[PDB]
Every structure is written in C-alpha cells, then in structure tokens.
C-alpha cells in the first residue's frame, strides 16, 4: 500500500483487494454458479447474447455483461499475479489516445482543449503510473510510452483490440488514481470492460463458447442482481428433454 | 387420372433430374392439400433464418429479424420429408445402401423392440417376420418404382429415396420402418396408400433423438447435419403448414430489437 502512502500461468496482504474479494463473495449466487458450472452451450445469437441449457431449462445469457463480470472478478482475485500477453506490435500510447479522441465515444469537445496536448498529457500521466500498472496488473508501458503488454486474464484470449484506444483514454480520465480502494476497483472495472465481449468491437463464436463460457464454469461467482437485471433469462422449460 | 398399374420443375429437392411427369390425381391432390395449408410467413422465416444451435436432436434455436425461435426439428424435418415425398413422387434419386439389409433381420430387430407393439399373444416373431418379408416382396415392384425403396429378389433392402442431398436418415430406425411399412400403411386405396406410406417414410427420415447417438453422422456431428443439411433444406423445400404457428412446434422465445451492430 506504498503507492498510495485463472489463466493457468505471491500473496496479497492488502486490505483493499481482500476487501474487494469479500465484496464479490458476498453477492455470490450459488444456484447461478451451479447453472454456469454445468451448462451445455447451445449457440451465440450475436456477440452480446448466447443460449445455454441446464437441466430442462433454456437460458438467454448476456455474454457482454457475464464476461465483464468474469474479467472483473479475475482482476480482483488474480491481482498482481497475472501472466503477460505480449503485443506483437508495440502500440504508442500517443496514437491510441488520438484514436480515442478522434472518436465519438470520447465525448471530446473544444472545451476540453486541443487533442495533441491532451494526448501528450495522457501519455505522460500513464508513464507515471506505469510501474504500478505493470506490477499489479501486468499492463506494461515502457519508458518510450509504448504499450507492450496486457494481463493474460484467461489463456488463449486476446481482448478485442479495436477497444484499445478508448480503454487507454478511460484509464487516465475515468479511474480514481487518488484513493486506493476506488483505484483498484475502477481500474479493474475499466479493464474488465475492455476485455469483455462487446458487439461494437467485434471465429468469435468459437472463442465465446470454448474460452469465455469455459471460464464462466470456474472463475465467476455471479452476483444476485443477475437474476433480475436481464443478464440471465429463462426462456423456456423442456420437461421431456432427458426422457 | 386413376392409377391403373399397381392398383426446379425438372429437378427434385435433392437436385437430381426428374424422369417423368406425375399423372395421378391422387398425388396431385395430396400436393394441393400441402399447398392449401402453406403459411408464407413461417416460410419466409425458415428461408431467412440464422441458425443459433441444437439443444438436442429434437429441438433447435434460430433467429429471424430480431426474434429468437425454438423449433421442433423432429416435427419440422418430418413435415419436410413428407412434402418432398409427395412432390418428388416417382422421381427420386436412389440412396444406395453400402451393405444390403435382409428384410428378415430388420423385422426381427423391430419385433424385439417395444416400438413394434409386439406381445406374447401376437404369434411367434419368426412367423411374423417371415410374413412381413413376403408381403414386402410382393410390394417391391411398386415401392422401387414410386418411392425408390428398393428390395432385391432375395428380400434384401438395397436402396432408399435420396430425399435431400447428402442426408442419410438415422438407420437405427430402419427396422421399425420396415415393420410399419408392412403393418401401418393402407395398401387398399391409392391416395391413402401414397399418403400413409409417405408419412411412414417421413417419420423414418425425420430427426428423432431415440435413433441418434453422439457418434451419429447423418451424412455430435449430427449437429452439423441438422444445421447445414436439414435446416438448409428447410429454407427451400418446405411449405410449412399453419398449424405449426399454433401446435407448439415453433415458439417465439424472445425479441431483441437492438440486436444489430
């Protein structure tokens, strides 16, 4: 705590991460966990929605939010213990920030100030956070301000890289870099979203079924709100399925 | 007019060349009855569906526009194979069996299963099997002619109709089919013969879970066949009847109006 004064690849004493670990465990819905552990996968409707069967029930599942939640929990639980996913091509944080700023999801306006200057600031700001980012999150930025590494949260998974610019932006602009708990939480949340399957940034059917949904058998304590928020829907019951 | 022998319009659904015009009012009338019950909207849906996946051999999921549907593969393929039988009547290409199957051994296998309805009071199996063989031997000429169900002089089953391309029906169903062919078909009247025989063959060709295991090919790779052979054929060769909208075989499960990206 000085800094503040699952992929099949050290202990964390920090009371902030162990507290976030406890918060996940608390909302953990065991019957949903069982359903996901034992699902038989049916197919993807689109990148956002998948169909799965458990006993005689057919479920519609929000892959986007399920994978988001999955990666968030893996971030909190494998914290500081991540394998590294090397980028084949190093990506200048500057170009990434510019790609972010030149896109409508940035919400950039002239009141923000010129783009180049904001891009440069983002690079310098992220260079400062680099040691901590590489240490705890295996998010690797070198002294040239190139991104060279991302956490390998699960094996054989590369997050949709078209989401990389906006990830980089929100990492500087949306993360609470000032309070330890809100930092680790908001960072993991931003990273979770970047890793999540999101249709706008989308062979992917294969990854969803065999990589993402496989890890959903093991590495998620799904929250209780999933039974009511519309991320998991029972579409039908087939009583004679096993008859 | 009347049959007085035994009693794409140039192509089949299997993309084989036809051989002769269908001259019989019986089958023409059965064709009209299919056409009469046709539902253009279900048809459009099957034509333009995007397959999601099989739950098991009986049930699949597909989506069309923004709607997700649960579809009874068994009853859909049944109906598909029935319509092909009626339209391609006497014009089928032949699915040749890699090894001939003696009708006796098939009937015996059938009599040994509960689906046959055999009971101890019915008579010896061997005797019921022998009768079935001789009965089907007498129908062999008409069967090969009109339906491409081919039995040679020795009582071996040697060919089946190729209803759609690259599909082999679940052959574990063959014994009960042979039994029911002898037993459940109305052989007395022309129209009811052609109809009840097509119905029996359609059920034999239909995808039924009790005759499908994890190793089945049909050409869980039965899953590949269901998606790419059976449901592909469903895009073009079926006029789904209106009762499919109400009988529970086609159920809308969800609407995803913001599906697109």
Residue corresponding to tokens 């094996």:
A155
Measure the CA–CA gap between A11 and A80, rounded to whole angstroms.
9
Mutation target for B interface from A40, A44, A45: give the one with most B CBs within 10 A.
Answer: A45
Residue corresponding to tokens 């998974």:
A157
Q: How far is A93 from chain B (nearest CA, A)?
A: 27
Measure the CA–CA gap between A202 and B217, rounded to whole angstroms.
33
Determine the length of chain B. 261
- Inter-chain CB proximity B256 and A202 less than 8 Å: no
Q: How far is A242 from chain B (nearest CA, A)?
A: 10
Alpha-carbon Rg for chain B, nearest whole angstrom, is 19
- Inter-chain CB proximity A60 and B254 less than 8 Å: yes
Domain ranges of chain A: 1-243
Whether B15 contacts chain A with CB within 8 A: no
Which A residues 180-209 touch B at CB under 8 Å?
199-200, 202
Task: Write down the experimental method used for this entry.
Answer: X-ray
CB contact set of A225 (below 8 Å; sequence gap of 6+): A27
Measure the CA–CA gap between B13 and B81, rounded to whole angstroms.
10
Each as own residue / partner, the long-range contacts of residues B242-245 (CB below 8 Å, 24 or more positions apart, any chain) are B242/B37, B242/B38, B242/B39, B242/B42, B243/B37, B244/B39, B244/B42, B244/B75, B244/B76, B244/B79, B245/B39, B245/B42
Q: Which residues of A touch B256 (CB under 8 A)?
A: 45-46, 49
Measure the CA–CA gap between B234 and B245, rounded to whole angstroms.
16
Measure the CA–CA gap between B40 and B100, rounded to whole angstroms.
41
- Please state, as a whole number, how many other Cβ atoms lie within 10 Å of the Cβ of residue B193: 20
Lookup: tokens for B113:
């299963």
- Inter-chain CB proximity A235 and B254 less than 8 Å: yes
Measure the CA–CA gap between B127 and B132, rounded to whole angstroms.
9
Q: How far is A233 from chain B (nearest CA, A)?
A: 10
Beta bridge partners of B38: B241
């Amino acid at each position: 705590n000085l800094y503040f004064q699952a992929a099949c690849t050290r202990i964390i004493n920090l009371t902030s991460v162990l507290s976030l670990q406890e918060e996940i465990n608390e909302q953990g819905h065991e019957v949903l966990r069982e359903m996901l552990h034992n699902h038989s996968f049916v197919g993807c409707v689109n990148p956002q929605w998948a169909l799965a069967q458990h006993q005689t029930k057919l479920y519609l599942l929000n892959t986007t939010k399920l994978s988001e939640e999955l990666f968030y929990q893996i971030l909190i639980y494998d914290f500081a213990n991540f394998g590294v996913l090397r980028l084949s091509e190093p990506a200048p944080l500057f170009d990434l920030a510019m790609l972010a700023l030149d896109s409508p999801e940035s919400g950039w306006t002239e009141e923000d100030g010129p783009k180049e200057g904001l891009a440069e600031y983002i690079v310098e700001f992220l260079k400062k956070k680099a040691e901590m980012l590489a240490d705890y999150f295996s998010l690797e930025i070198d002294e040239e301000g190139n991104l060279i590494g991302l956490p390998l949260l699960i094996d054989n998974y590369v997050p949709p890289l078209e989401g990389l610019p906006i990830f980089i932006l929100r990492l500087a602009t949306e993360v609470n870099w000032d309070e330890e708990k809100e930092c680790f939480e908001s960072l993991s949340k931003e990273c979770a979203m970047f890793y999540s399957i999101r249709k706008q940034y989308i062979s992917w059917k294969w990854t969803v079924e065999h990589i993402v949904y496989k890890a959903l058998r093991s590495h998620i304590l799904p929250p209780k709100h999933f039974t009511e928020d519309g991320n998991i829907l029972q579409l039908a019951n087939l009583p004679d399925l096993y008859k």
